[PDB]
Write a protein that binds this ligand. Structure first.
Ligand SMILES: Nc1ncnc2c1ncn2[C@@H]1O[C@H](COP(=O)(O)OP(=O)(O)O)[C@@H](O)[C@H]1O
Ligand SMILES: Nc1ncnc2c1ncn2[C@@H]1O[C@H](COP(=O)(O)OP(=O)(O)O)[C@@H](O)[C@H]1O
Ligand code: ALF
Ligand code: ALF
Ligand SMILES: [Mg+2]
Ligand SMILES: [Mg+2]
Lengths: 448, 448, 448
DNA sequence: TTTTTTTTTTTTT
């Protein structure tokens, strides 16, 4: 008979210390819960202690015994004599933290044993469940265990700890001779004048109108980053297939249009320049592309965690686009769904320390204004995106709106929202034929 | 005693198929390994088969017996008589992939049981390991479990692999289609591109609103399967009488107006088409339909077993529909009744190894959404249905909800869940006059 | 035989505590009387204790024993040995108030039982009284019960009591010679001219668009509170990691540009400023920051109570922001969830007597208007927010919406709700480089 | 466990 491991002496010491000192109750309340006690009468005792403390009543022997007696639970836990014995057996509450740690350890061990027994029972008797069902159930149980055993600190942090961590980060950055561009370098020096590269755990939003090269600019950034860094990056282009964009990926590098790439022409003078550029992409092995239209945030998070654990973190996550992901729970309201999606993306970016660039559509009210320059009040699914994003940029081409204009080729990236950084406008040189965004080497006008 | 789960019959069928058909060995070796067999003599047999295949020796009864006798492993695996019994017990090697998948599933479940036993042992015996150490050990074990089956084909992978696949696809598709079929034909090659044919023992659920032609589409699938196979087809029409179903089938096959057939106002050419369709159906004589209302799953299972025994198996089962079956034991709880019905249908499909398509109904709240394209949550009692079903497809028609829709005559079959293929939308052409679904020959819209 | 409810152990604890500590006698006198004791000897003992305390005699073993011997009640209460037993039975008198509450509850229940017995006796023997007479008698008894058991407030308070409390408050304020910020000082002279400091138990809501510096202004307020008081402050940064918040605080206090700090391009003077700021902050050591996401109000309340207990109260609570908190009980209704969150926050603020500033987001409809200066309706789910809040301040920046605005670097803090003050707009100077808010040192503009 | 009426507040276009 395998009795589950436990420490009843630790339980009695915890209860007696609570009877002697309620001020450490939060120290007991932070570590263990009512169900953490191995013995059900001890669970009832701790529940009644929590009820007395939440009422503001001091926790002693007599009050707890009377509170249990009013509920008919005094005799169920052993009577007044058992509670007096438990109070007597505890000499001091000074080391009650170690006893609570032991109780929490025993509770975690028993929970692990129970989950393992459930997994074994489901394995011996599948009961109609297939391979996928059993694997998903096991992974869900393990995720519950891991999330229960990750919730340890989850509370206030003193200034001294926060100041030490922040100054450690500051000294780490100071010792690094990065020479500017601390984040993942975008490959655009003018962009790095404001953005200083794609900082990790940042929710960068490239929100642009359709047929503005929004996906083109995002993939230009992705390709430039892959040229610069070798950290594994991630792409989720739900809208367009990876087959098309790869040609565009070979269009920026060759600095030409696709045209013959989409068709079946063979022109191997600059086509031969591409045949060999791909090899440069071959040796990198740091881009993971999966269109997978109709994605949920859970699946995206699972894929991201998989790739990060496989190849040591993620260089850059790419999402195309925000208005394509499906959340079954909040499918009723689109704005709530977008809020949940953006929250999940921000949480994943903070978890894996990776910049996330996601594309967003806009509203038609932008073009209805006299000023067709996109601002923070023009985004489709308005509130949630502006609330949750860290960096927000707008692609503005005056040539699209006004064909007779001086900004032909000049793609204005309006930084509309940046918490850590000055908002503004960065001029570029978008090659509309070549589908290649480049830097603006012309006369940079003053932003009024 | 909790005996570990295993499938000895699947192992025997795999070994006999490898003895008879060596060319499917690469099919078998992709799915199972030597250690996947629960029985150690089967592990030795698979190891010797792998050794003979790597050495170029043919894998038959005599060569395997001689090779096992050379290593002294003939007596360890049961002997020449046992090997001959293994060869004899396998009627055909065509379905060896399903047996190998079953053996792989049993190996995965036993590995999960072993890992759970290790976890329980570490819980009962910490052996110096702290909570962090046990947490890391459990996470490492579940990481190995995930690494046992981690996407593989579903995996996006780094730039190199997807790049060499995609540029090869482009350089092949520059002017040449070169379709690879890759699936059992169900009358829709575009559908068979994703579904890869009607997978046996799978629970396929097609869901639509009433008047969306769900029964019409199911009948078209049944007709295509019947014209593309010799195995008999079984239909359950609880919603409609069998004569109306026959009229729908004749109208779909002969491409005549349903109204003219129903009213009898048919010309000589329509009569000739009807006579030809009747001749084809009387040539087949494999269509068997039951229209009894309120049928229990027990009666359906008994009749299906009767038909399979009388005809050496059934190609396809049709049920119309899920919500019309009756369970007297669960008449009080509708959701539990639906769950038990779906479980019984899945068990029957696994037992008789026949695809079963049962129609389903949606909820009204789907019409309350801005997007009326169905999802998994729109099903009535969707919780059990989504888990039990393998291939879930929805029928959507924007032309129904929009009079000025440009997609008139176009129906969207949205695969929402597929365990063995990609999800997504396939467009088809609908003839309401003929009540027929056919391949969409219009421009191929790039789904986002 | 149903015994009337009592707690003899609690009574003995009370008697022994009164023998040991007479200073809590008033605490005993507030809750219980002599007739509240179940046993007549205990009633006599409490009567003798009351007589001794009224006469000024100490309530100990010897004096009480002598008084009971002089009145001849020493033998009736158990004798000197029993009195010494009662004295010995009490280890501590600190929890004597809860024991008195227990005895009070027992007395109330016994009185209820006695009155119910009287009513049943009058029912079985009407004795000429009509149904009206018996109803009047029963209602009179229930009125007597409700009057006797609820004398300790629990209802409408008398005018005179509120008048005395209010005049005590006014005299307290008059005696205080600070003549200034009654509440926690904001660090801004013109703001404190209208707010008189951040008053305790007040709900303050700061509303602005994202990237307007609302969190920056809240951090500046936190810095001012920390520099102007020794009480600890509490910060909830659910939007940003605590490292970024600390970097913002360092940039604001040290007046160094955030770009150089983030990029690490800091000179010797900037490093000296940062080091001095760190020294001052570590001298203070009164900031506690939590950046956990999805926090329920229960966890926030528990942590706030813990910090207040550990540090003798909390000066200020900061929440960033309202819409990032999660309540599982009202996850389906966002508006009800926001209402319950705001209600719980106001309850906590009144409980701990601490100003709580929780940030909020604006709807974009205000940007649809010609005037973009915020109103009360522009907040998200503002219906409960405006009611529950004590102070509401909007942050407006015309320079954001107008490139040629003359108010560059100027922010309008529009007090839109103030229960004890006028509404109106106060101008402040904003340093985007240092991300700091300061008193506006330009010319004063008349508010029309 | 399921859907169904019905009111109410919020946000979106
Ligand atoms: N002669 C016809 N011409 C055009 N449309 C037709 C004709 N006959 C039937 N249809 C359409 O075919 C659809 C089939 O849907 P239906 O069979 O009613 O769904 P269910 O299977 O739930 O009964 C109907 O919506 C109907 O409008
Ligand atoms: N280095 C810098 N130079 C100039 N302005 C900056 C710099 N860094 C940040 N800012 C400004 O500070 C603001 C921060 O606003 P923020 O505190 O995020 O508002 P909220 O907290 O309401 O979202 C941004 O709008 C940005 O324009
Ligand atoms: F009305 Al039907 F299938 F014919 F739902
Ligand atoms: F981006 Al914020 F409060 F910092 F909305
Ligand atoms: Mg039908
Ligand atoms: Mg902020």
């Amino acid at each position: 008979l395998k009795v589950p491991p436990h420490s009843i002496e630790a339980e009695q010491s915890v209860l007696g210390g609570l009877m002697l000192d309620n001020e450490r109750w939060d120290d007991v309340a932070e570590r263990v819960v009512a169900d953490d006690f191995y013995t059900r009468p001890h669970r009832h005792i701790f529940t009644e202690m929590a009820r007395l403390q939440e009422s503001g009543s001091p926790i002693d022997l007599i009050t707890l015994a009377e509170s249990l007696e009013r509920q008919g639970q005094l005799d169920s836990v052993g009577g007044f004599a058992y509670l007096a014995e438990l109070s007597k057996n505890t000499p001091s509450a000074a080391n009650i933290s170690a006893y609570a740690d032991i109780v929490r350890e025993r509770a975690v061990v028993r929970e692990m044993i129970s989950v393992a027994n459930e997994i074994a029972e489901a394995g011996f008797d599948p009961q109609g469940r297939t391979s996928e069902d059993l694997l998903d159930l096991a992974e869900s149980r393990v995720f519950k265990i891991a999330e229960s055993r990750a919730n340890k600190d989850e509370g206030p942090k003193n200034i001294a700890d926060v100041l030490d961590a922040t100054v450690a980060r500051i000294e780490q950055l100071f010792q690094q001779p990065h020479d500017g561009v601390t984040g993942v370098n975008t490959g655009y020096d003018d962009l790095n004048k404001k953005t200083a590269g794609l900082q990790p755990s940042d929710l960068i939003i490239v929100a642009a109108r359709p047929s503005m090269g929004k996906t083109t600019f995002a993939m230009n950034l992705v390709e430039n980053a892959a040229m610069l860094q070798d950290k594994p990056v991630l792409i989720f282009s739900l809208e367009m297939p990876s087959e098309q964009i790869m040609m565009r990926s070979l269009a920026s590098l060759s600095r030409v249009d696709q045209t013959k790439i989409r068709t079946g022409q063979l022109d191997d003078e600059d086509w031969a320049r591409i045949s060999g550029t791909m090899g440069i992409l071959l040796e990198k092995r740091n881009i993971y592309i999966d269109d997978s239209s109709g994605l949920t945030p859970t699946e995206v998070r699972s894929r991201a965690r998989r790739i990060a654990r496989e190849h040591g973190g993620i260089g850059l996550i790419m999402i195309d686009y925000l208005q394509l992901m499906r959340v079954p729970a909040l499918s009723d309201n689109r704005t709530l769904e977008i809020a949940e999606i953006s929250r999940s993306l921000k949480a994943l970016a903070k978890e894996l320390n990776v910049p996330v660039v996601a594309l967003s559509q806009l509203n038609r009210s932008l073009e209805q204004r006299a000023d067709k320059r996109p601002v923070n009040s023009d985004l489709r699914e308005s509130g949630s995106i502006e609330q949750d994003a860290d960096l927000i940029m707008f692609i503005y081409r005056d040539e699209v709106y006004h064909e007779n204009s001086d900004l032909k080729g000049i793609a204005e990236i309006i930084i509309g929202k940046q918490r850590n950084g000055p908002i503004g406008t960065v001029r570029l040189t978008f090659n509309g034929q070549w589908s290649r965004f480049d830097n603006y080497a012309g006369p940079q006008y003053d932003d009024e």
